[PDB]
Amino acid sequence: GPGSATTVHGETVVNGAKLTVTKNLDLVNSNALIPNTDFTFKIEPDTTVNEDGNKFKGVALNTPMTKVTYTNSDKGGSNTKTAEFDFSEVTFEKPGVYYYKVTEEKIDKVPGVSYDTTSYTVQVHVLWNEEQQKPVATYIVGYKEGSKVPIQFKNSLDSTTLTVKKKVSGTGGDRSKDFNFGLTLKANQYYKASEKVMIEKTTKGGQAPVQTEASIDQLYHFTLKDGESIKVTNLPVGVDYVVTEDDYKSEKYTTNVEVSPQDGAVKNIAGNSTEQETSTDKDMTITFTNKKVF
């Protein structure tokens, strides 16, 4: 090489018959749990092409779908995964640019996931190869809306919060009494047993909010005084749950429950426990009112 420079008499080889598809899972809550699921990608001959001497409709692949898989254990990781399409076995009859469309298939929709609807046009440049004595997929160019770009799909993972509050009313209500509660989050296919969600308890005085963890499929015990709350801060969407307060009728309390989703319709339950609710993308506030009079 010139002076102190170092000369490499060739290059790193790129496989011009293979196309990488990248999945980026975009978390609205950076602490979100990662659901067990696939993302599927399909490649199809582009029908919209004007078939002249150089441009061709793509030749259909034998395996026109590929996928990436996510599991609960990916949490904390990069949340980027790759798959690949292979064009090496595709028989091209003549040199040309062969056009395909690459999309993400939203077949099994996961609660709280927003699916990328991007459609990439992919040009497979197929050049005559003197060695192999045939037309060969030589390089691949993909583009979205007027820039040649790596093929990436970006799916968004939303999650939610559940806030449980205690309110004491009546002239007989003890505002310094601790009421006992249980929270159960039920496991499903997306989020298995023992995965943990984050819980913050706020008390009304000088102490800062306290952090704890609750396991899916495991009863979580907590207490609340009037005007205190807990908040599940990274509750996944699609998760069934029950909140119950102990029975305080023998201590002369009446208990009612208010189930209030953010922009939704408030729900009043005379009694002691929520139904089995299912978490949605809306923040849920559940208030237990304990009333005592003379």
Identity of the residue numbered 231: K
Place of tokens 């919209």: 48
Place of tokens 């996510």: 70
Top-tier CATH class for 16-158: mainly beta
In angstroms, the CA 127 to CA 76 distance is 43
40 half-sphere exposure, CB direction, 13 A CA radius = 10
Integer-rounded Cα radius of gyration of the chain = 29
The two domains 16-158 and 159-294 share their CATH topology (first three levels equal): yes
> CB within 8 A of 289, min separation 6: which ones?
167, 168, 169, 255, 256, 257, 258
Residue-range domain boundaries for the chain? 16-158, 159-294
Among 274, 280, 282, 82, smallest CA distance to 184 is for 274
Task: Give the homologous superfamily in CATH for domain 159-294.
Answer: Collagen-binding surface protein Cna, B-type domain (2.60.40.1140)
> CB within 8 A of 285, min separation 6: which ones?
163, 165, 258, 260, 261, 262
Report the DSSP pairing between strands 277-278 and 240-245. antiparallel
**Burial class of 166 by CB neighbour count within 10 A (0 to 12, 13 to 18, 19+):** buried
SS3 category, 16 = coil
Contact 35/68 with Cβ under 8 angstroms?
A: no
